[PDB]
Design a protein around this ligand. Sequence first.
Ligand SMILES: *[C@@H]1O[C@H](CO)[C@@H](O)[C@H](O)[C@H]1NC(C)=O
Ligand SMILES: *[C@@H]1O[C@H](CO)[C@@H](O)[C@H](O)[C@H]1NC(C)=O
Lengths: 49, 216, 210
Amino acid sequence: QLSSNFGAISSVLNDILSRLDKVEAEVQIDRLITGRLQSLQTYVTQQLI
Amino acid sequence: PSGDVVRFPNITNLCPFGEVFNARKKISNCVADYCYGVSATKLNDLCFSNVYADSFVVKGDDVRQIAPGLPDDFMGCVLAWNTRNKYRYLRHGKLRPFERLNDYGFYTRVVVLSFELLNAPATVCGPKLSTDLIKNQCVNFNFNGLTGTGVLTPSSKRFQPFQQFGRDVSDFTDSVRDPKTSEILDISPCSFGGVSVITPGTNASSEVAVLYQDVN
Amino acid sequence: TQHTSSMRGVYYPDEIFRSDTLYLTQDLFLPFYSNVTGFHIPFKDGIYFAATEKSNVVRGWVFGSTMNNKSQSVIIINNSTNVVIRACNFEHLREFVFKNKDGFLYVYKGYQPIDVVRDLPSGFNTLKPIFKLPLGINITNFRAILTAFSAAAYFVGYLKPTTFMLKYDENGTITDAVDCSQNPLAELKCSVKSFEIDKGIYQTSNFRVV
Ligand SMILES: *[C@@H]1O[C@H](CO)[C@@H](O)[C@H](O)[C@H]1NC(C)=O
Ligand SMILES: *[C@@H]1O[C@H](CO)[C@@H](O)[C@H](O)[C@H]1NC(C)=O
């Protein structure tokens, strides 16, 4: 799920920070942060069960 | 990290970036000085291949027609400028992107730059003072288009002549080809882990031991 | 004369190095066991052109819309020892692949000896990214340019958008592949990412009646 985009321009950091420097990068990073936070929470719950 | 490492193509030249604007053309093996996928102020730190410029004459009445909605998955930079001090409106079917009756009648240009990156050996990008190679120490990377951090070491991977990067079984960059044709693998970001503190409880002493989880 | 291409027409999808991995990619490929018209021809966005000649019998290609002094066209020939390419209003086993995608005309190459009688040989091989050109013209048809003087024969195939499962060797070169749309079994292989599968029942993609 790390090699998976979530609607952002790119799925790898340092390639949004390289081509953007300000709020434009913040809007893309928030899409990745949300997507990676869900797949991590889903993993933990399935481990508890 | 411990140091900064940079590696750029040794080619040096003065670029026609200025001549073309004031007068489709290719630009390669130059050093330009100086948006739909890149920031203008961030353009002078990335290295592309064969930047192309599309040039044509149209008055400001048609500048608002050149934009997606030009491919939809492609990027580029657009400049325009007017000074006043042909076209087709009949054709059976439209055209695919990047392919090629009346007169406007001017009485008293639009440059669509295209960037190609990380495909062929880097040949077009701005000033960047190079640096020597350091190995076996957590350092910073500034290869052609790979800014990161890790530890470098000689590699034993048989690159094909037409390849310049490396990939793992999970699509991570665990190898690279130096712009001087050397295969050095950047394995791991040196070291990281967790920290745990062992204490007798603060009701008998204030002495603690620390465990570092996964380290040599 | 219609022949069958067993497993020919595999090329390197990108310029990245890989080892001991299986890669699922979607692109314009040549599906395994298709029809090739043995010639002794519209482009349709992709052509697998392979030729067999004894001592460089013939060579050449032409691309365009009308192909008669009316619209732009492209040429690829050999003058003395180098390839000549131009774009104007013009008047023992070669393996090539031509693709027209977003202006750029890509090209791939391969070579192999063959000892065949009168048709295409069997087996598989690989091609490489040799050329790619910003011609910028609309290509609809093509036709090879012959060299009149020995029997000569060239074949043509058609590329379609399909998904392949390519196997990479530790040495870094593509070895085998699976076409994930030929058989129900082939779809199963591309789903579990293997080449041998234990007995059982496995659920795969869904189906609709269009
Ligand atoms: C290329 O030209 C042919 C000529 O009939 C036309 O049918 C076709 O639509 C053109 N290409 C595209 C992408 O429209
Ligand atoms: C890989 O390469 C080595 C030598 O380059 C060769 O001996 C071997 O047969 C090749 N294929 C393998 C190991 O599967």
